[PDB]
From Swiss-Prot:
Widely expressed with highest levels in skeletal muscle, placenta, heart, spleen, testis and thyroid. It comes from the Eukaryota. The modification Phosphoserine is found at S313, S464. InterPro entries: ARM-like, ARM-type_fold, CTNNBL1, CTNNBL1_N. This is Beta-catenin-like protein 1. It holds the Pfam family CTNNBL. Component of the PRP19-CDC5L splicing complex composed of a core complex comprising a homotetramer of PRPF19, CDC5L, PLRG1 and BCAS2, and at least three less stably associated proteins CTNNBL1, CWC15 and HSPA8. Interacts directly with CWC15 and CDC5L in the complex. Interacts with AICDA; the interaction is important for the antibody diversification activity of AICDA. Interacts with PRPF31 (via its NLS). Interacts (via its N-terminal NLS) with KPNA1 and KPNA2. One of its GO terms (biological process) is adaptive immune response. A motif (Nuclear export signal (NES)) lies at residues 54-64. HEAT repeats lie at residues 3-53, 58-100. The lineage of its organism: Eukaryota, Metazoa, Chordata, Craniata, Vertebrata.
Length: 482
């Protein structure tokens, strides 16, 4: 159809909108008087879905106050109308369609945001009722809208969350309603809001969200969830929780919500979620800000949980990934721990004639070998690239880095840092053991030292500048007393 067909439609809607509003004001409890215009409005709304197909003429909608009318209509006293509008809004903003016309799309988006679209969607949700199939579908379309908007443009997630979305999502997740498709959807949307968005992580924390997250996870601590969809939800929740843990402010909250105990329990009871519960543990401990958590871990016998996992790797989660988190956690513990807990941790490295140390060195040799092979492969790639005429650029460099990471760079680094910290503790047995074994193959003290220097260069991206010198300093301190 043509902009002759379309331009009609909008203004028709406006008339039908305005008229319906007027009539509804005039006869607040005489249904008879507004009803046929109610139907007229509904029909015109349904017919609009058409417009999605023409992505540019979106610019038009804005101009003739269509958008604004729509936004108002999510407040319309009759849920049948608002659901219909929601559906229309979801069709308009279906992401494939948007990537047809970025100009029509862009201005529509701008209009939508400027109107507090998310806030009005949430208001609508607050009065929807899911025991009624069309309403429940309204919720789903609502969520779909925000998923579409996030995909088209990130910056707004911060504003949207504060516009009551995040809080509603939390309420929905804690709601005592059987798991259903909406809940799953909620779980992914929350995760989408939370990646890279610290004000939302913070906001979640303030909203007491950490508790909520832990309780849902609580649910499947001993048993697995009923269906594949519910397990995907769990994974979603886990992701969200890890995101939240990137913010320092949230480590305290985790601690006081007994997050640590829970994850420990999960690790002991060998659920599939355990692969994730290891990740969570890792996140909960990484930086200086994971110091209290590190100590509490030891207090609750985390050591007994973690060391068996260190000694043996059980086989979605691969062997490498499993080792990675464990070693990372150990690294964090060696960094942050102090006093009795630290002493206890070191005792593990002495025990059974430093079997842990023998483990460590075994791991080292495993990952090192891999690393060597990958780096050789990368060398060969370079040479061939030169021969052909292909220029090594940023994309080729990132691809190489990914390949290296796959081979276990981070875990290697972690191992080596453990080795270093261990040796720096005044324990002859340990140093002897390390040096014994290196010289048992010869290969070697400098290698480790090189590896540690590489690690020191890089991390952190990072949080503070002054911090980053000091950390490098302390790492290098470990290299002399080796």
């Amino acid at each position: 159809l043509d902009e002759s067909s379309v331009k009609k439609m909008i203004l028709t809607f406006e008339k039908r909108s305005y008229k319906n509003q007027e009539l509804r004001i005039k006869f607040p409890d005489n249904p008879e008087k507004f009803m046929e215009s109610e139907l007229d409005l509904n029909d015109i709304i349904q017919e609009m879905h058409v417009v999605a197909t023409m992505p540019d003429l979106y610019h038009l909608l804005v101009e003739l106050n269509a958008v604004q009318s729509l936004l108002g209509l999510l407040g319309h006293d009759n849920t049948d109308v608002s659901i219909a509008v929601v559906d229309l809004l979801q069709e308009l903003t279906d992401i494939d369609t948007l990537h047809e016309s970025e100009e029509g799309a862009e201005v529509l988006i701008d209009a939508l945001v400027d109107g507090q679209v998310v806030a009005l969607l949430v208001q609508n949700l607050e009065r929807l009722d899911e025991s009624v199939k069309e309403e429940a579908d309204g919720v789903h379309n609502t969520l779909a809208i925000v998923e579409n908007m996030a995909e088209f443009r990130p910056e707004m997630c911060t504003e949207g969350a504060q516009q009551g979305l995040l809080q509603w999502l939390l309420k929905r997740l804690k709601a005592k309603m059987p798991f259903d498709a909406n809940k799953l959807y909620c779980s992914e949307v929350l995760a989408i809001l939370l990646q890279d968005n610290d004000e939302n992580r913070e906001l979640l924390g303030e909203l007491d969200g950490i508790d909520v997250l832990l309780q849902q996870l609580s649910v499947f601590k001993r048993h697995n969830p009923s269906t594949a969809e519910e397990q995907e939800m769990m994974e979603n929740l886990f992701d969200s929780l890890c995101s939240c843990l990137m913010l320092s402010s949230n480590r305290e909250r985790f601690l006081k919500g007994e997050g640590l105990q829970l994850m420990n329990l999960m690790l002991r009871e060998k659920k599939i979620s355990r692969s994730s519960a290891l990740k969570v543990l890792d996140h909960a401990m990484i930086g200086p800000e994971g110091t209290d958590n590190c100590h509490k871990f030891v207090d609750i016998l985390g050591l007994r949980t973690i060391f068996p996992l260190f000694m043996k790797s059980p086989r979605g989660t691969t062997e490498k990934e499993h080792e990675e988190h464990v070693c990372s956690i150990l690294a964090s513990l060696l960094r942050n721990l102090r006093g009795q807990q630290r002493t206890r941790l070191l005792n593990k490295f002495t025990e059974n004639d430093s079997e842990k140390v023998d483990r460590l060195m075994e791991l080292h040799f495993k990952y090192l070998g891999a690393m060597q092979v990958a780096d050789k492969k990368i060398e060969g790639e370079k040479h061939d690239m030169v021969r052909r005429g292909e220029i090594i650029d940023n994309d080729t460099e990132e691809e190489f880095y990914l390949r290296r990471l796959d081979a276990g760079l981070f875990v290697l680094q972690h191992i080596c840092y453990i080795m270093a910290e261990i040796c720096n503790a005044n324990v002859p047995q340990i140093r002897q053991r390390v040096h014994q074994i290196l010289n048992m193959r010869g290969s070697s003290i400098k290698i480790v030292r090189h590896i540690i220097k590489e690690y020191a260069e890089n991390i952190g991206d990072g949080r503070s500048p002054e911090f980053r010198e000091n950390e490098q300093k302390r790492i290098l301190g470990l290299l002399e007393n080796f």
